[PDB]
Amino acid sequence: HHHHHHSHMGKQASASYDSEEEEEGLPMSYDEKRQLSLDINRLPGEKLGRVVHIIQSREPSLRDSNPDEIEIDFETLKPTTLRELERYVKSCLQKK
């Protein structure tokens, strides 16, 4: 708590986009899956529990289960769920 005056404005819209979601349900490479394990490992405890909340939305058979009990294996979930995780982490730690 030293120096309280710092002016700030952000105004210049150069080129933005607005795309759809899609599933893109492709069995991705091992490198993609361990990259998710790595990015998610950097994320908050919330955002770790959130990757589980995603597989729980996909699998009602896991939705009622404790997210603390199980970890997120990217091969056992749907070909779409690993892809939904792929984009989610890159929406969370960086912005798109």
Coil/strand/helix, residue 73 = coil
CATH number of the domain located at residue range(s) 30-93 in this protein: 1.20.1270.220
Dig out the tokens for 14 from the structure. 């150069």
Rounded CA-CA distance 83/79 in Å is 7
Q: How was this structure determined?
A: NMR
- What is the DSSP annotation of 13-55? -----------------HHHHHHHHHHHHHS-HHHHHHHHHHH
Say if residues 40 and 48 touch (Cβ distance below 8 Å). Answer: yes
Angle between helical axes of 45-58 and 81-92 (0-180°, round to 10): 150
Q: Which residues contact 51 (CB under 8 A, 6 or more apart)?
A: 40, 43, 72, 85, 88, 89
